[PDB]
């Protein structure tokens, strides 16, 4: 729902005043980094399911009992797997949508908003998705700027988490 | 607020899905002339008190019953006068909140809506604006796309006087 430039200018027609110069080099510095989060944004969206899979093994791998203990929390059916998938699914695809964005708006309205309360209402760990960020941000083949805006938001993710 | 970016962010998450490539091009777009709107938008605002000032002259030039009338209606005393530029610089204003944002979305929010309502009510003439901004359009010293991305918004403010 917040990028910068839609704050600023909300600011700005609330005081009726041009926008700050400080205002002006933000919005710049947002643009000028546009490009490598829109690589970004496409790495991660062609590469989805692969990341997603194999994010989804390594919490398995890390947390061996969330495939062999039952119960709707865990993934022993096939059920849980799908809703793990979904939930890895969920974490990247607002990751992209910040990414576009360039600001964590997206990250801070549909995911981290009463994440730990979703978290723990459906006794889910906090640490299963840490760990599958962790396996996102090292594995998105990525270089240069568009590994760090990457990086930023996943580390965003990871903090909110912890 | 809605930019191009909004726009496409919505439109992915309503579906629960990533941005389709038409939406990526849509934006990608935006940015490949976000450098040419950020010149315009610093031009216009570090020069804006001369753009208003030659703006309101040209409107006293080309309407001179403006500066010769009695009443609250036109500019012969300096309370008109200073209302006639106060007026030219919201037009500005709002201009550059349209260049930053790289679409309509702040002119359709912030000065069309009611636009007409304003200019009855208070019996303002809407080809007063329309010379202030063709003076603003030729007067702007921009060059290239930066003037385009100008133009653009321009002749938008002054299609919805007409
Ligand atoms: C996968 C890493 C682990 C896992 C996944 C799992 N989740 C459920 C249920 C839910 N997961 C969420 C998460 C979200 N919904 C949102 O809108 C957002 C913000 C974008 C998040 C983070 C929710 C709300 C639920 C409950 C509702 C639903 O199921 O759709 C399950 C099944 C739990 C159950 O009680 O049925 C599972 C298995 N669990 C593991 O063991 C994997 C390691
Ligand atoms: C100057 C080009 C000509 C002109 C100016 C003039 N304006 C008033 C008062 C008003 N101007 C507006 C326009 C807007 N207010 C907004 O918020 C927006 C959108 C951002 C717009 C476009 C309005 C609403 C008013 C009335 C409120 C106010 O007076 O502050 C006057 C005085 C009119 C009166 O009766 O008080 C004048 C003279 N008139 C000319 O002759 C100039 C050529
Ligand atoms: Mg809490
Ligand atoms: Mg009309």
Redesign the interface.
Known sequence: ?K?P??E???A??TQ????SNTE?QA??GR?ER??AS?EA??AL?NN?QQLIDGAANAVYQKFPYTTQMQGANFASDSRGKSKCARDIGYYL?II??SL??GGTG?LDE?LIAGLDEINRTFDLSPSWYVEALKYIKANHGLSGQAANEANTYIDYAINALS
Chains 1, 2 share one sequence.
């Open positions: 729902m990028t430039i839609t600023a200018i909300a700005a027609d009726g005043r041009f926008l002006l919005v710049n643009f546009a490009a829109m944004a496409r969206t989805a695809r992209t949508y576009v964005a997206p549909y």
